[PDB]
Design a protein around this ligand. Structure first.
Ligand SMILES: [Zn+2]
Ligand SMILES: [Zn+2]
Ligand SMILES: [Zn+2]
Ligand SMILES: [Zn+2]
Length: 133
């Protein structure tokens, strides 16, 4: 029932390159962009072979430098693992020029209430945002 049970994201964590994830991907970025439910790939050439993911709900990804930059800004949804770069989505604003992006359907849920899946702040606080492509 308490805040301690809320999941927090892993957007800032990095896993070592010991599982050959980059090699199986051809050293191409594994990011998936979501724009109002339309999914698209990246496959840009990667520079670092360490892997990342916003939560353990999804598999680890090797990423291009642009998508690693967006991942550490909490622009990837921990619920589904898709990046929120354009279209409509929710943003939690814990501090100046900090935005945690996520889909309305991907909020954390505890005791019937909804929370930011990055940081655990109440999601009724979350603003709806529309960003052009
Ligand atoms: Zn990429
Ligand atoms: Zn995050
Ligand atoms: Zn999502
Ligand atoms: Zn948050």
């Amino acid at each position: 029932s308490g805040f301690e049970e809320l999941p927090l994201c892993s957007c800032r964590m990095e896993a070592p390159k010991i599982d050959r994830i980059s090699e199986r991907a051809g050293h191409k970025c594994m990011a998936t962009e979501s724009v109002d439910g339309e999914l698209s790939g990246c496959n840009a050439a990667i520079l670092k072979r360490e892997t990342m993911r916003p939560s353990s709900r999804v598999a680890l990804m090797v990423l291009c430098e642009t998508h690693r930059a967006r991942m550490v800004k909490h622009h990837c949804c921990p619920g589904c693992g898709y990046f929120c770069t354009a279209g409509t989505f929710l943003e939690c604003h814990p501090d100046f020029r900090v935005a945690h992006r996520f889909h309305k359907a991907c909020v954390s849920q505890l005791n019937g209430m909804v929370f930011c899946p990055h940081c655990g702040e109440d999601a009724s606080e979350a603003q709806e945002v529309t960003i052009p492509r």
